[PDB]
């Protein structure tokens, strides 16, 4: 899969951003997808999944807070996070469940965030 994540940047803390993830092929209809992040001195780790019925599931740290949607026609995963606070400081990344395990798994540069107090 080919992916690529845009919408990172500095935000103060209880501020929102919406994160996108453009994907090539069909990974976004065929394929569970969710988006992960990596903390400074931590390993990627799933936060939010979107299963192909439309079904959803967070982490308990940003359920309420984070929400994970996609359009099947724009090749595009978004992660609408609000509430923000200086711990979801991190490089998010979005791509196929398991791929911090499944083989042949490829992650895009990802996108930075940075909440300020
Ligand atoms: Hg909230």
């Known amino acids: 899969v080919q992916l690529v994540e845009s919408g990172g940047g500095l935000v103060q803390a209880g501020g929102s951003l919406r994160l996108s993830c453009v994907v090539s092929?069909?990974?976004?209809?065929?394929?569970?997808m969710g988006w992960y992040r990596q903390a400074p001195g931590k390993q990627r780790e799933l936060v939010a999944a979107?299963?192909?019925?439309?079904?959803?599931n967070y982490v308990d740290s940003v359920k309420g807070r984070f929400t994970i949607s996609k359009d099947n026609a724009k090749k595009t995963v978004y992660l609408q996070m609000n509430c923000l606070k200086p711990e979801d400081t991190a490089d998010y990344f979005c791509?196929?469940?398991?791929?911090?395990?499944?083989?042949?798994?490829?992650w895009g540069q990802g996108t930075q965030v940075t909440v300020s107090s």
């Open positions: 092929g069909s990974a976004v209809s065929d394929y569970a």
């Open positions: 791509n196929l469940l398991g791929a911090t395990t499944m083989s042949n798994a490829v």
């Open positions: 979107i299963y192909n019925s439309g079904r959803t």
